[PDB]
Amino acid sequence: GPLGSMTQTFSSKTEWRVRAISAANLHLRTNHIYVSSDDIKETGYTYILPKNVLKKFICISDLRAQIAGYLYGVSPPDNPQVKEIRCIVMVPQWGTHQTVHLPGQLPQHEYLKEMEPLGWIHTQPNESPQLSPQDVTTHAKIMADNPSWDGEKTIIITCSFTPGSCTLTAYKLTPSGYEWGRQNTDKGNNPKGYLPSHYERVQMLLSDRFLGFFMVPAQSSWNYNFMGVRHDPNMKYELQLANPKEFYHEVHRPSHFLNFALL
Amino acid sequence: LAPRQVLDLEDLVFTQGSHFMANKRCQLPDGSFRRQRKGYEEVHVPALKPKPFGSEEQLLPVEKLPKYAQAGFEGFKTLNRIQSKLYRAALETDENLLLCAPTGAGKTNVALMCMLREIGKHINMDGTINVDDFKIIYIAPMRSLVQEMVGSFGKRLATYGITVAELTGDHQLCKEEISATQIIVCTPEKWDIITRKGGERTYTQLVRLIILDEIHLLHDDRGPVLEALVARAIRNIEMTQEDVRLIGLSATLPNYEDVATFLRVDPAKGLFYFDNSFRPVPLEQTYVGITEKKAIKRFQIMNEIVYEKIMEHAGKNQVLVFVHSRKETGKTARAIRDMCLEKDTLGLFLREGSASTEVLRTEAEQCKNLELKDLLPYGFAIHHAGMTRVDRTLVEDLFADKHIQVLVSTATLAWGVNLPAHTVIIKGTQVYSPEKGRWTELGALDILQMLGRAGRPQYDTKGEGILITSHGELQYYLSLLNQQLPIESQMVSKLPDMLNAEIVLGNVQNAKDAVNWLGYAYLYIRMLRSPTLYGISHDDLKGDPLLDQRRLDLVHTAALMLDKNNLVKYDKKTGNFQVTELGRIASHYYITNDTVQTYNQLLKPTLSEIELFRVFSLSSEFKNITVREEEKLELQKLLERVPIPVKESIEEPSAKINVLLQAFISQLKLEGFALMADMVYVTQSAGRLMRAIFEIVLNRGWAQLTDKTLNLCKMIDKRMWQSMCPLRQFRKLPEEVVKKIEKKNFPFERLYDLNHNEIGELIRMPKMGKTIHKYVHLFPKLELSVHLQPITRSTLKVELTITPDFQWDEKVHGSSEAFWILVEDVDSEVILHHEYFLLKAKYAQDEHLITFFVPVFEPLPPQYFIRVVSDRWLSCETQLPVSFRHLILPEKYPPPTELLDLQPLPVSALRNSAFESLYQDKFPFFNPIQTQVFNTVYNSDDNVFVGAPTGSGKTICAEFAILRMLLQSSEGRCVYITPMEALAEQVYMDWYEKFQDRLNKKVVLLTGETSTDLKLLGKGNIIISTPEKWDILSRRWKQRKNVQNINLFVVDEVHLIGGENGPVLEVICSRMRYISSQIERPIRIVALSSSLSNAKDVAHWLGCSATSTFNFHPNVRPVPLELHIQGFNISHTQTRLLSMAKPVYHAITKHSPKKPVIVFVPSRKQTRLTAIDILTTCAADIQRQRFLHCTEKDLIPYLEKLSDSTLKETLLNGVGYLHEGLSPMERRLVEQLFSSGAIQVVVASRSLCWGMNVAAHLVIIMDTQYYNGKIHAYVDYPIYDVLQMVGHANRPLQDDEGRCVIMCQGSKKDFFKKFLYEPLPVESHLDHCMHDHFNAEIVTKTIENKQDAVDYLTWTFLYRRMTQNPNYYNLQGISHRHLSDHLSELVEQTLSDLEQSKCISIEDEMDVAPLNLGMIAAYYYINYTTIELFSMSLNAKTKVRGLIEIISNAAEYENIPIRHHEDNLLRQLAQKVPHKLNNPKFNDPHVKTNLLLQAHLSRMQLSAELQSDTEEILSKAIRLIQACVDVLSSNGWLSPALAAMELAQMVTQAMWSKDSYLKQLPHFTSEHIKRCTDKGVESVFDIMEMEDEERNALLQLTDSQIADVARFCNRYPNIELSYEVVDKDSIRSGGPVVVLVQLEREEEVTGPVIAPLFPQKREEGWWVVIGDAKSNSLISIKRLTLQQKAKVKLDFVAPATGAHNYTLYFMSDAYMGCDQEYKFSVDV
């Protein structure tokens, strides 16, 4: 019975400052990147991801909120069974630890008009063995809305934060996968009808022989996890040839710089 | 001295700062006494009696001063007593002075006298002062004092035209400030940092006088920087032998003799000690020492003492209480008011007379401040820094007007306001210092100043100073205010830092120099005088009487500290001090060395704002900052409020510093007192701390961190985060508006696309729209465009166009606006290139052009980026992505020509005894390159390309072609073009000796005069020429048969087509190929060249068979070259050169310790400096390598013939130097000494790398940039100069190899490795240089339409290279339609420009024809811009002055070199120069030309390099004058036409028009002129008319001098003409007037024009000019050359039947006086 005798006072410990201190060190994880590389589909397309944009993508992310990029690329001359990823497009987005939220409008830009879309890459906190039902649903909805996404040519690369490192795996949807994903409204983790036959691993390699580039939004940045209000599923955006700013950049959270200053 | 010791400098530091009390006993004046009181002791010291005046003490009246000095004492009748005792020493000598006097006794008027003597040193006869010929530095310890000093000295010296000013924090505006500021007033620290930087074209050279005010600051913690300054000043006086006068002003305190020693003050001649009886008002002192040690009791005890002492003056004396915070002023004044209220006391200050009380009530109702609202009505007032300027001025006025009776203030009022009170009270002597993180005592200067403010000077008969302190400090303050606290040195507490600054400056290069340096510090004299204080035993000192070992140990200790912190490389054996970039940044940004070690340890490229703020917070400046318990609450609520997370706990002071910085940016006003003091200190430091970080991470090329640190700099400086509206940076905007705008959260960038209406509507505040719009377009904004020009498949040239896109407004942007250009790789992780950019207000509206190189690779990266960011404006940046998707790289270059292993070809091969005589007694065989080409050159007529490294002997290949020519045509004509004039001269010597002396042909060297040059071309079998001399000749090839008759055309160093003067070369070669294609006989072409990657293009252009194109790549040099490239990662030029000094010496001893070496350096100064430096390093060397390889006895004959003391000093030790300033014989004899083997090293200026007649075993290229002084920036050596320099390391007949070491900024290393180890790609730049060629081709009817211009261009190297590297020439394809379109555009643009300039006419769009101006430009070979500007500058009223100006602005003069200073001096004669322009300009080539022209016309004949510049002026003055007369003749005007016809002969004979003709004769003087005007009239013919003996009696002249006079008199024009008109009367109006004038010359032409004041040999030219004088209407003109008898016809069209006469003129271009003026009538 210490009410009055023993009295302590609570001191705020706002959540994102720890995550920011943590994200400042992500660059260490980019020296130990591993691809799952299981002997799956030796005859499907192969996907080469340039290391430069992957390191950048890891470095601009958060350790709990997922970020996503769109993949654009091309097949190397007289070798059509290879898809070299040439570009990663960052669009206005927000995320939770299980899913990412993007505008329904796909990227459009002259620089992109020569390339084909190859699906998307996203980060996730842990190394699940199967492809997420949220991922299968997201990919299928996207496909249903955009005929330029061949279910046989577009893939989903998950970048999972294994301790001290970064493990990459690449999947694609199966026909039954597409058909189930497009009709799924259960945002939960065990929705009705989900099946492991809905996806299959595709081979993926990390290269150094060439370099990717980034396109970013023209009038803003890509991160809206501090402005999720201002994010809209129907928002339109232009792009520009520039490199994305890291997750906790000042322009991503202008509230933190204006509120506590003016008040 | 090897046995040494490492010291603990901490145990040597007087820890208590200026509170150290060296003395142990204190003696008070008679009459002092103590009272005891409960809790506190009082000591009273009575006011002092003035000393009786004494022997010869009379106050000097201002009239008895030197009269130039009396204006400075205007408004004063007699000087002070101290000013009188010092008038002679201050004004009549230049002695260094030290004046010790009590505070307020008038030292600064003594400083005025010193400044006045310096001012008098610079007064002319016109009365003006040479305000640009000196600088005076007044060092004042306190910023407030500095501002009041600028005001006071400015007012007292304005009557002199003298500018007094202080120095702001910014450095770019500071140079403009210093340029025209005569008296700079600053603190010790600002002067220290300025002279730390040093640099190029500094103003510290003009400084004649330094004043150190309050020099007893020496005893403060700041003292060491006064030592730094004085040591630097005196040592620099020794290394320039130019004296600087030092004046110290000091309070009276022990050790003034030591200070005088330290200032090099002669005690006998310039030391003045005035004891405290000289205080202007006597001072009765009360010291109160409180004994109570419980704080709560002490606070009330002190307020009790304050009250009681105030009552002793209430209503009798206004009392000024000093307190040591901004809050304590009010807290204390209110405490005193409340104690007055509790008693009846309040009525004692405010009188019963209500005047003062009502003034106070009014001003407190006018609401000057809330605390003022409280205090002003009662008679109390406060005065401190936080208040407003109006409130502070009102407080000062109300106190001076005696309305306030109790003023409570801070030290700021004692320093920067003259405001004495009768009674001064110092309420406590305890102050919070954040640097020491604790409470501490007041500095001695503050105490002295405050108690100096006691006693109104004329109002009071005595003043009363009360000082309240703790009891323990009594004997201290007693000492300080009674002449007994000695002045000690605090040097060791700062020794490493200070030492590093003299290492970074070059002034200290080893421990020996360091010891020498430390002998100048005040620390040294104090250690000598009283060693026990500084830790030296009395047996120590007798063991070491000069303290050499002790100084060695201190320098050793500081050196090791600096070495551990990575500021310096300290080699303990040698004792040597190698500078580092870390060291330099710590010097230049004033950072302590511990900090920069911390930065170097923690800075990583993957750093974020979080770690950045932590790294900042870990700085050693913040070392003593602590987190006090009472702070932790207020800190806590802020830690979780700032936007940058802080990793570590608030228990740690690093976190507190971080949080304070973030709070200062966010503008959170704190509550705690410790917090506010610690924040002001932290953020004071943050500016240059962060700027030092930014320089570090920028110069390592860390793109992300560079961005973050420049942003943080800017945020710290603007006190806002970038998240805030950029408009907030306009202070004139009201924060209500920017709050409205920030609320809307919308992007600022979208404001640019809206009119003012939609602006006002979007912000929901329409009445502001317009205004917002204005500021939106005032915000700095730049547009960038890019021209990608590939050099190879791995190096890319970029031209970046910066077009400004914002309105300029001086009240916003000032004189300039600075940006960084950062070229960043694809990932934005590395800065591939970067540079500073200055947008000047001059050019706010102009596009700027930047060019640089960047590496590339294959496969091409997706893109690079170019960012331009404001250096000071927040949120102000433009990024342009440079995509490479459409970049067309040139194809990788072909393999070289295989060097075949042929057997060495004997001289026998020549098969000709006469020919073999040229080479027999030189060598037996030819080198492999000549051996391989010999058959093709000698046994063929093929056109040939030899490409090979310099020193491969490519010149003998041209000689092969010539010998073959000589075997074919007994009268064959060969023309040899070489691009450099000095090469032409050397080749002229060699080929004159070979082909004329031996083979008996005519070798000639074109001179530029087309008369002599045409006769040479007709006469010579070998004609040597530079490109433009050949261009002017061969333009008229259709009317010049000799130019077609050429059998052989050799062009040497063809690769210089790529360089700046390439277009003329390309054009003359293209012309020779066109001519040959027209003639029946093809002209053989042989081209010699440096190794070229794209040789095949050159050959195809010049028509060389594949099999006769010899392109050898640099690894086939006959003498093998070993090439080392040393990178130096020091981005500051002077420090980089310093850091390469010892490398130069080590390179000599490693690669050529016994064979001759040449060192190239960037400038003239550097030659002398580096010769001396090599010599010093050689002396200090134990295994020393001497470069004197002859006997000193053999050297005196050669030595004493020189005029340069240092040059012969260095030549004695075997090291010479060459620069553009030596006499031609000095250079020749130093060269021969080098040739002799006598001397082993020569240091040559980069500018002489084309005309050097020596070669060497080892070439060292010291730097690779030089400072261009008209763009005020450094410039990279052309690659051609580097290849030329490397060519000097070549001695076939003497060395098995050559060795070259090229030292360069690291950022250039790779480029050299790419362009020296492989052959060179060269391009054409004729597209930027076509107007003058096109114009000449239109005059010669070669180009008559636009199709003709296209076909012309196809003959060029440009057109060949456009299909091989299109993006370089800005084409995007190599199709025939691409080509023809691009060419049509080029043609169209050039013809349009010519047509606008009224040079050509374009009829029907297709056809072109030449006009008057185009013809004049083509004839006299003059830039078409020059003559267009001439056209729009000449009126009939322009005179000789306007002519000299107009021709001074010619384009032909823009490239004249720049050095300045002596031009600022030569301007002085502009009052006595018969030339009026009324324009002040400097650092401009056209103005240098104008000055040097007047200098020539008045035979100033003073400077040396400026003389060569004058000769370059004169090499074009005559052509420009003739073009002027042709223009003015087209205008028909008479006055300016004949004015310029006279100015021709003026510039030839070096005379004005007032100077009479006699000055033309040799050995003549002005006295001779007065004589020849006395005894008769003044003509050259009149000299001839004199009786020979009368001539001699009037001459007083030698026999050979009279022989020279007669030589001139025989070559002087002696000619009469005959005016004659055929059909004298039978002419009709509008009809033919044919005037034939014949000229009889009395003797045949003896030779060229006698004119020794003119560089080129001329030949007499004449004009016949019929023009009516009254009408200013020229009728007829003709230009003519005469031998003895010449008939010249002129034709004219009559004006009317009115029978009239015309005045005739016959005027020379050369000889003054020979002009005649007849008249003749004509009847219709």
Ligand SMILES: CNc1ccc(S(=O)(=O)NC)cc1N
């Ligand atoms: C501190 N400057 C100094 C110190 C000592 C001497 S000394 O000649 O008296 N003894 C070495 C002369 C000078 N200028």
Ligand SMILES: CNc1ccc(S(=O)(=O)NC)cc1N
């Ligand atoms: C490795 N740090 C560094 C590298 C190169 C240079 S530089 O002299 O070549 N200029 C950018 C300067 C520095 N501080």
